[PDB]
Design a protein around this nucleic acid. Sequence first.
RNA 1: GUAAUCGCA
DNA 2: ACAACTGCGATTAC
DNA 3: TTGT
Lengths: 653, 49, 61, 333, 145
Amino acid sequence: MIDRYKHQQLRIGSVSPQQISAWATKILPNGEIVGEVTKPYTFHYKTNKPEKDGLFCERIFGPIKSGICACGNYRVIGDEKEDPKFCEQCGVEFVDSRIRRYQMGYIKLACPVTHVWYLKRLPSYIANLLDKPLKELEGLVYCDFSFARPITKKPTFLRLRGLFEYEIQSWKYSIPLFFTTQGFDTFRNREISTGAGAIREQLADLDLRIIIENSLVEWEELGEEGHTGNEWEDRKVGRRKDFLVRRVELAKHFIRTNIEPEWMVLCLLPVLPPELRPIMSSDINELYRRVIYRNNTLTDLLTTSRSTPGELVMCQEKLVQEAVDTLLDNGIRGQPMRDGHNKVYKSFSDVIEGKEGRFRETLLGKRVDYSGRSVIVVGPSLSLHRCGLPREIAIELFQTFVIRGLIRQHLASNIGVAKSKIREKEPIVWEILQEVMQGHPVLLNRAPTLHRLGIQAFQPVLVEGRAICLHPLVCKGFNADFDGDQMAVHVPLSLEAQVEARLLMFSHMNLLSPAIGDPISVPTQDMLIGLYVLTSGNHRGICVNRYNPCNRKEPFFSNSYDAIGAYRQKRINLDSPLWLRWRLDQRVIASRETPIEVHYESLGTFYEIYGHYLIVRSLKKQILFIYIRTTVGHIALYREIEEAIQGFSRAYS
Amino acid sequence: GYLTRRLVEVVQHIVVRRTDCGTARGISVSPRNGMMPERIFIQTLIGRV
Amino acid sequence: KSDHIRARQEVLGTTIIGGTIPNPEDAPESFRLLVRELRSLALELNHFLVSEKNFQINRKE
Amino acid sequence: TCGIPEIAFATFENMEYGEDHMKPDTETYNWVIQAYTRAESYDRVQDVAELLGMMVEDHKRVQPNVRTYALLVECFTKYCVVREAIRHFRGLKNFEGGTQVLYNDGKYGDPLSLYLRALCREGRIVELLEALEAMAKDNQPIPPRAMILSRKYRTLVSSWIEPLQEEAELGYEIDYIARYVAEGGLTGDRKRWVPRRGKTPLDPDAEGFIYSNPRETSFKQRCLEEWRLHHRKLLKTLHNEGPSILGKISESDYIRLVERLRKIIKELDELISRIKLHEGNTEFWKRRFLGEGDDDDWFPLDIQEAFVEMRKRNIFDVSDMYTITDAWGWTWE
Amino acid sequence: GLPKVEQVLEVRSVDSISMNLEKRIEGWNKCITRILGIPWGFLIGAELTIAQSRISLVNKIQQVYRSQGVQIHNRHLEIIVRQITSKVLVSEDGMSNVFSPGELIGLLRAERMGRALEEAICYRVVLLGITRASLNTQSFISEAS
RNA sequence: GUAAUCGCA
DNA sequence: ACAACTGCGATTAC
DNA sequence: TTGT
Ligand SMILES: [Mg+2]
């Protein structure tokens, strides 16, 4: 029994800047490269047109209309005549405007930024790989500091070799003048670095094998006698050991995952497709404009002159990094960074994470077409497979099917005439609607879908009203009461879905709850009362007679049909006792009680009187006659069950 | 509602994909171990292989 | 019935003509959105189904 | 031979949990071990261990062959698991041509050479001599991976001496220029020892291993380490076995032995020799488990009473007490 | 009632679930190291703890459900319980190329590795709460997210 | 398109 | 730092 | 808040 092998493997990882560039980079026919976002403008002033090289730019992302372009000349894609893919005058390509939905962008950053998830989370992967403490890295990122040696694979003349340089007061003006100024610029990277170059050089110039070796050595060293010490010292040793183990695991994974720790610091930032952030304007786009403005100001300050003050460019770098942090994930650092109305900005982490986040709100739960809701009422003359459905709902659910019916029969020429006839409520439309859904299954469901019986399948029956009728016995499953409850309706389009609904999801196939396997559909409120009145019994003792019968039931019926007819004719009451002859079955459940009295005559026939039946026999030990003492209710219940079984068996043939 | 959600997640993956796995071990159900409730013993035995 | 633009467009045509509705193989717009979002967050996601016949990896976009 | 270790595991699970006619055999386990061992994407080392544990079915005709030992040695070598690699190489030695099968034509990094290098680096040179004797018996020449270090003195013969990563004194001075032209001088073909940013080992001995070459440890260091480990496990047995021991002198000898053991790990020698470390003796453990040596369902708090309760409830039994030693029948150990 | 049901399932503490259970578990953890040696002590201790915890975890939930008249079959409770008690925690002492200290593996996988590998693998049973269990799964998109 | 507020069962 | 019922419908305010 |  070789199984059908299906192999699907989703993969996630950190992406290089080359890939996020190739997600946006495109080569036009002229030869220019598009994809770079460089201007904060989204739309033109009082023109409602996409600005060039902006967040909504047509050139880098795509055209706003299908077949139309920003140049003003409409074109048809896929035509037989030769047509240029993109206008020479305008970069926008001639394509359907679905690309704006799936097309990405990227902003080049002059100063690198650090990912918030890796840095500012309580488990810091960057602080784990770089044994430097988390406070030192957070300072070097946010508070102007200096790292003495960021490169360990190149020659270094200066012998500072320090972790955190709290000030630049060290003599550097005499050092820069001495060396050629261009030369000083050339080696400053191997020299003390600040802000976002030290982290990238440490992550890049690093040997994971040396890291795991040193961590294993330090692990072997620690733990010899740490437990013997105090609880504080043992706790410190334990925490260090756990940090070392996490470092070993991170380095071992980085060795064999074709992912580089260099990619944790983002050189280039991707930009979401325009349609996904449509401007009405979204915060996403507000944060995008802010980071674009800060980045272009930083680029202007850098390209202006090298003699520019370091304080200004450093502050603008901090502002760019804070904007990138607010864009990616806001709230991890603890600063809300509210809007002008003192309202916090939403971030991508807030978009994905949450009940109202991307996952739970969209992927795992969604609404469908072909659906309707209405209140529910009891239909007490429906069968377990049939349910009452209003016509104004059915015409909207099965509209395409009745359109196809009007097209097939000589009643409608085109789809428009058929839709107009359906809107006009013509009488033939209702006939076609009835003929359409005679074999189509309807999926009803309820809002509190706790168990698996919340969604079932029935056969829709056209009714004249606005309330969906439901069978009474099926209420327990849905926990439904007709006090204002509403339900939804779903129509399976595909043939496989129809077969599934008709075979698996029907009520007659689900009569046992999946908890303990007990009957879930049983008479509950009124049918139980009727059955109890039927099978209750009769006044037997002092209630039926005022005096003792010692000083001193009557009707005898050969068939149950005669007794039921007498009850219908009001000859005998419901609880009135009677005698019913039985054909040698002895199926009456009763107590293990001996006969109260036995009459034996000379000729050999002895009468045995029991509590609820009389059994006459003869000398040959032959059961001549059996008479059961009961009421019309018990025989009515027995006859209705037996006749249901027999009618089912006969209808099968 | 909260309790119903979490439970489903933990055991969502399980699905019957084999007729038999080949295990030769089984739990031993004895009444006298747990004060011998007859109804509980019957409910425990019913449905098992 | 929810998100697949192409399939949904084809559903009306197949129902009006009467042909059988094929099973959609492409990812819904919700998944594609996620990929775009996660890749805006610098996180990749690829389907990468592998054929059991010839042991080849095929990316679904 | 695809390169994805999950397509073969699906077939293995289909065979394992299927009917009797489709149940796995030794060849199936060997194929899945080869698939998991020669992967190029992730660790896949615990997978091989779990597969070996599943391979423990003694009375199901599932017995190891030459390929099983060869693949296990290769896997445990590539992941620096030297002890189990030696355990399985001792079994591979018994088969004829087993070392030739381990050297799978040199297509997959010369696993025999990787095994020899792993033995040389850690310093377990007695097992290296055993492997060389096995290769001589099976007529297998040394693979060409006798890689020299930065110092040309390094070889599998003497890289384990006390002076490590240092060249010995010779009468003639070291002619580095001669060496330069010997490796290849100005022919643009020399190994330049310069660290690079990419995740590629500059050392050529690390090639073939999943993570890195085994750490360099001398023979004397390995001997002192195994001595400390033996004394530490002896002290552990003395601790978890109570004061009761073969030695009859309790008072002074206990203190003397505990202080001498604490000194060793970091003339009364007969007392230490009396302590016996019973490791791998399944019979002793089975005899110990057998006991020869509210108002809810609760097990008795006593250990032996819990054991008899489990044996009564069939949770665990002495028949289930087995390891590869017994199953694959390796007597030598 | 229902708060007590949540409590047992998310095993915040073993004292919460039962004092006798915690006492027996710590007694086994302490004593089993002495007898049965290294390779056949961890396995038998894990099996004993699994049996006792499963029996306890069920009996408690079934009693809580039956006190109110709710009749549920023990099979549904068992499937969930297995997941809670199906993983093991490696102790901090043992670090090797195969496994690292503090990792979480499966009971059957741990036993099969202990049978095969001479390298001492020190593992102890960690009952994992429903939530923790979900956060530790093979799929990062279904239960982790 | 998002919030606030109430209701529903 | 993290999560705490399920959905539906109405209004006004941006 | 409540607890994790
Ligand atoms: Mg109601």
